[PDB]
Amino acid sequence: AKKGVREKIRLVSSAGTGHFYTTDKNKRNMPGKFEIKKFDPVVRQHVMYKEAKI
Amino acid sequence: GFEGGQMPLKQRLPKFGFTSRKSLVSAEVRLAELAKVSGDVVDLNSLKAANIITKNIEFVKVVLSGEINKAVTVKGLRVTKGAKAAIEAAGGKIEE
Amino acid sequence: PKMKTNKGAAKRFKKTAGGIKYKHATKRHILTKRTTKNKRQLRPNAILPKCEVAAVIRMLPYA
Amino acid sequence: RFRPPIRRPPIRPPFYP
Amino acid sequence: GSTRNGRDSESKRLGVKRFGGESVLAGNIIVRQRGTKFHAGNNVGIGKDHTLFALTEGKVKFEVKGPKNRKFVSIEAE
RNA sequence: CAUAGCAACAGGAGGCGAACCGGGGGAACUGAAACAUCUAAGUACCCCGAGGAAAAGAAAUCAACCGAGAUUCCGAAAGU
RNA sequence: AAUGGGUCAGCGACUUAUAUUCAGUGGCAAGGUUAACCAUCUAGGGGAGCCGUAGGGAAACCGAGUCUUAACUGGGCGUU
RNA sequence: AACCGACUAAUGUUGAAAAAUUAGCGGAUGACUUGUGGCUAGGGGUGAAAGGCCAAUCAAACCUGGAGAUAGCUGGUUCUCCCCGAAAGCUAUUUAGGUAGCGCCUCGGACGAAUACUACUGGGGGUAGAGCACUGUUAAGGCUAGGCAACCCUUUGCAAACUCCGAAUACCAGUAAGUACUAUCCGGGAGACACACGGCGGGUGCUAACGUCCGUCGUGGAGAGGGAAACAACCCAGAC
RNA sequence: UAACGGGGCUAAGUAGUAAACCGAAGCUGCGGCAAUACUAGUAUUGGGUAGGGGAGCGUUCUGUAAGCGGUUGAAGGUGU
RNA sequence: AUUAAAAACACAGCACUGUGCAAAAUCGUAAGAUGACGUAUACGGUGUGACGCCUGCCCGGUGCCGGAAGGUUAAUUGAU
RNA sequence: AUUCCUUGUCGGGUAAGUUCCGACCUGCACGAAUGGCGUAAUGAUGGCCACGCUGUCUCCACCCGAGACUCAGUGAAAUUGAAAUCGCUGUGAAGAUGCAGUGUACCCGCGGCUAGACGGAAAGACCCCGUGAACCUUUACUACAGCUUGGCACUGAACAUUGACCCUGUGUUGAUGUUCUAACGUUGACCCCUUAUCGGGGUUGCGGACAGUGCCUGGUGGGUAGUUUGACUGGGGCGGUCUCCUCCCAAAGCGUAACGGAGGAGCACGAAGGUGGGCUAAUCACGGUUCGUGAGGUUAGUGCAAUGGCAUAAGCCCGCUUGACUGCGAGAAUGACAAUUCGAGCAGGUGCGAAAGCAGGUCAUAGUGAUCCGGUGGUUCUGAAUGGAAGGGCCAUCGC
Q: Which residue numbers delimit the Large ribosomal subunit protein uL15/eL18 domain (chain B) (predicted)?
């Protein structure tokens, strides 16, 4: 049976490229919106990416 | 395509692509075929008369295949750089 | 009668000079867990293996 | 063990149809 | 009147894929293993799953080396 | 009042026929390797009405900025 | 000691149409071939069309290249 | 008694008869029985109810049509010679007696030793065996913490899921001789995917089974001949 | 009978030694046919189910054929 | 009807229930019928089954009957 | 007519009674209109007992007839590969007329009998199987009839109350109630067509915008219909199982079955990932209201099974971080295929490090789900007169 509780999230580029990474989080361990530097391929730069739904 | 009831190949693989409408009324023409045209002017009507393109064709690209031995003026059709060169080398023009 | 094309096969298998070309499976959903390597390498269309061809040809009589 | 069989049809000749 | 057993995984086709003396191209997988049953020696890389592969063309050589007497796969220039 | 009704008279019709035709109703087996959407099939069958044919037909049609010119039937486009 | 056959004679089961593909054979050959139809009718007309002559790409489109990618040292398919 | 019925038995069961006869048996002024004619019709009728009956037919009549329904099932499939010649496996399957790809057969084409056998060389083994160094398990004695006895020591065994060790074989690769139309690739056509026994290694079973499930080799299958009284599958041996 | 296949055997049993022989569609000899290679001869090869491949026989009908054979006896039937 | 004649069916009696008459109910798309030229002491359905003594407890479930407050809720409407 | 154990136990009846009768009550698993318990009479009803009676039997005998047998005439039948159609023991597709060995046996009828010819008859009804069929059931699925609900139509008028809205009390609409008649109903009466219990028309009464019907709509709906209801399986059912990972079976490459032996997974983690620096266990001994020293040598540890690994640690601690990067990818592994795995290196941009370097998640091997349909973002490729747009595509991603 499925015991998986980590919510999937889409991390979105802080540039307005609309490029997103996807991942998951434990919402208990991370209540707030996740933020992390990630390479945006459209602007070809490492920029901040921020959590969003789906 | 029936494989004993295992999900066949024609269903386990995804559909892909679309058909443009232009594709259905487009026709490549070899440079060698431009021989068959009667007269200097290579246009859609002259191609159709030569039966090089069917009568439903609207858009033609001439491609570098074979050789042109006459001076032809291609009006209205698109030509490849290589075909253009070959046309112009045989004393043809490419009209717009 | 005229042989009918299997439109399922037609929409999934395209004849090229290089053989019957197809889209790889497993790139539709449930992608987060997959590796970018795996996802990247599935993105190019492929040519069907020899064993898969005979059937496809019988399903694509005019292609 | 002996399991009582059903070897013949329940209606017997000469009527067996 | 039943078995609690029944189960087993798919065999993972591990083992030496290219033995001593075999000529290998760069990239060729030599060993597939779980952990470093064989260690990577000269001209041999080790993947994340501890796959040993040829970094250069040449001949596979196995060798016990070092104070622990560990087995090493190397590619010999030939 | 009139109409209904009733009677007379004249002219039609009714039934039969293998198919073809237009229309009104309209299956299921089967296929989908199960099955319900779907298929079979608007088929079989039932009914009505023709005619030597019937039906359709003279653009509130196409096309594509060029043009075509009712309907029907046949070849292709295209198993697109 | 599983099936079928009392015997004889007669009859009794891979067909036909259409399309796709492969092979042999013939014609013609970077061309090959006409369909309906016409016809003084196995002739001859009839070029609509189909196949070949270019590929790559989902596609626009480009084209002996193209697709991928910001770009490939590249790589896929193609060229011959 | 007639008449209507049908409880028992015997006969009969290729009958005298597709339900009777003989001897007995029940009702016999009634919810009786009988003639003639009517009506109800098929998912319909009718039923004091048995799924009874509806023309010797009924859990859905009969006829004709759809219709050559469908039938992964069973049967059957017709002249002759020549060449080659399987499989009963894997994978998947509302699949398991079907089917698909693959493996194996054949035919054509390409290709030509890249193939097989052997010697030599280089490899990786963790099996057989063995061992007790580990993990377990076992016996005796010692020594002794502890409360008789750990733990150690000496001796002594056991192991599919133990290993300080460790073959033969097999496999992979290279080098080389000789023998061989081999290997490979691309096409056309399949068939097969119920296997059997025997040897060897095993699981299962009782180291029972002409048992069952694998591995591997042989034969049978698809193989006659000689032997084993007779005897697919054993021994010898391949029938123009 | 019925646990040598039987008769029967005290060796016609068991073990061994020597030298024989019998014994197959195996091998050889002689004759012939075929497949495939090679260069008509060689060489190899020729059990066979499913199945693949190759080559034929015969039947009815059309042309060839208003030809050819036939009441001086066709087809069919029945012998050789 | 033709392997069961019975303890099975029916039965008088009993009870529940529907039904106010264009009755309920049933046949029928409908018209029209039966019910009934009847009218609740009648008619239909259901169960029980002469007669005697009796026929207990449970209204949670599922029916059925009644209640409507609120909650939910279709077509419709069409605010934003 | 119910009781499993069970032939319960006791009593009766019999020489002897699993039945019968009476009774007991630990009623497996009686019970009150699916009625409970009685009950005269009735029953081709079930059980049991007795008398009489007997060829039912001990145990048959004889006799009378109809067949059977013989003659004459007629003349079937199922069946049938072919038969020159013995016994026994053995063999053998495993129960032999037909094989082996052997024993026996002149040829052929007729009357009898039925042990065998796995005799004849009917393509087993049992059992299983077929992605067969039918009919039946229901709180299986999906429908439909019927019933029912509301909206709208056929369908109207006055008032009264009231809601909304409209303006400046006013209209415009909506309900609700009463009243009304003119639609509509009438299976009330009368008249006529008309000799008519039909029907129509007329008149009148009673109803009355109700009812009823059409379209739409919710509910109800085995009344009816179409269907579905898995496979493996030492028959089948019941149970168990179905995908993935680890070990063993597995025969020292790979692979290898059983309803064989054992365990695990269907995640976790923004650090538990990257990197730089650092560190090294278990358990004892001994001394101390965790501490110190020694022995020991990884017996520890590893986010979670097992196996293989791990000190250069892969184990433990810390700083800084986002390489848990995007495009690609020589070359391999591994699969029928779908798919799955490893990967140097290249480009871009990045983190840690003085630097060589390392980093495309995690010690590794489970932690998963094709396609279709659809959702979200991007692209702006397509997009049917044109320009847009919708809708397609492509890229990312979500929904089993």
A: 36-95
Query: Looking at beta carbons, which residues of chain C come within 8 Å of A11?
Result: none
What is the rounded radius of gyration, in angstroms, for the C-alpha atoms of chain D?
11
Asked if E40 contacts E46 with a C-beta cutoff of 8 angstroms, the reply is: yes
Q: A4: which 2 tokens?
A: 């998986």
Q: How was this structure determined?
A: cryo-EM
Give kind and range of the element (H or E) at residue B87: helix B81-89
In angstroms, the CA B11 to CA B73 distance is 50
CB of residue B1 closer than 7 A to nucleic acid strand H?
no
The answer to whether residue A2 neighbours chain C at the CB level (below 8 Å) is: no
CA distances from C18 to B18, B20, C2, C24, C47 (A): 20, 22, 27, 16, 7
Pairing state between β E39-40 and E70-76: parallel
Cis status, amide bond into D4, omega within 30 of 0: no
- CA C57/CA E38 separation, integer angstroms: 48
Q: What is the Cβ-side half-sphere exposure of residue C31, based on CA atoms within 13 angstroms?
A: 17
